[PDB]
């Protein structure tokens, strides 16, 4: 889709995690790395790396 409310909602969450960048469980980090992988794939390149 790349253009929907859900796309926008995922990208904000990724922004949110990136600012914190300070995880405290395996699900938090795997959500972030999973969002990054999705971002990269939907939009070809984004400005943050997998941790």
């Amino acid at each position: 889709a790349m253009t929907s409310s859900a796309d926008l909602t995922n990208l904000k969450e990724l922004l949110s995690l990136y600012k914190s960048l300070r995880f405290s469980d395996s699900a938090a980090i795997e959500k972030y790395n999973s969002l990054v992988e999705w971002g990269t794939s939907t939009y070809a390149k984004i400005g943050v790396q997998k941790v």
């Binding site: 790349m2 253009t3 409310s5 926008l8 922004l15 971002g39 070809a44």
Partner: protein, 221 residues
């Protein structure tokens, strides 16, 4: 006159005037435009030949988004993508409409992407035959590729309007760039009404530690 430069070509419009930022493409632009211009000048065009390249005077170094359409308005193209100087063309009225909803300004006389700080509006193809869209695609091909590659060296986000127009845009680029392919503002079923590319771009930029785009600056009061 001072950041500006000039090179001469063998076909209308004979002189191409550009901002310094475009320098590494010109040698080839000249060469390609000379091979094709005869053929493409046979037809009457939107915009007029004297406007083909007026968007090469825009600097690129300060540009973080490129908002790209496939070709110019089949009528009344000013050589500045999306611009309707009397605010009449649908596509630009529908974009102004998205940004009214977003930034919450409901009183405006017009809208222009070309005044918005850090944005360059663009047309993949630089002319069409009057009244016909994508008519000059075959003429522009190698040039369109060359110019868009250059633009994407400077922008963080490329935003292409036209799902079908730009389905295979990835192919046209050397290295990857943040690319988003949205709906055309004239798409069926109001799909552009609920397209949220303008907000998405901003988040993407924040992720590249670039400053968001102020979409409201484009209003004309």
């Amino acid at each position: 006159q001072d950041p500006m430069n000039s090179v001469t070509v063998s076909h209308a419009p004979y002189t191409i005037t550009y901002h310094d930022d475009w320098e590494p493409v010109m040698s080839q632009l000249v060469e390609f435009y000379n091979e094709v211009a005869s053929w493409l000048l046979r037809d009457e065009t939107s915009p007029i030949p004297d406007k083909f390249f007026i968007q090469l005077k825009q600097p690129l170094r300060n540009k973080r988004v490129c908002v790209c359409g496939i070709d110019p308005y089949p009528k009344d193209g000013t050589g500045v993508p999306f611009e309707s100087p009397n605010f009449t063309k649908k596509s630009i009225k529908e974009i102004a409409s998205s940004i009214s909803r977003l930034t919450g300004v409901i009183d405006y006389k017009g809208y222009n992407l070309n005044i918005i700080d850090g944005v360059i509006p663009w047309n993949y193809y630089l002319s069409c035959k009057l009244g016909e869209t994508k008519s000059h695609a075959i003429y522009w091909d190698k040039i369109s590729k060359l110019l868009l590659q250059h633009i994407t060296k400077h922008v963080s986000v490329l935003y292409c309007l036209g799902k079908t127009d730009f389905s295979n845009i990835r192919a046209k680029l050397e290295s990857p760039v943040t690319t988003i392919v949205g709906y055309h503002p004239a798409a069926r079923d109001r799909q552009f009404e609920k397209d949220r590319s303008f907000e998405i771009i901003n988040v993407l930029l924040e992720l590249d530690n670039k400053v968001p785009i102020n979409w409201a600056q484009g209003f004309i009061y």
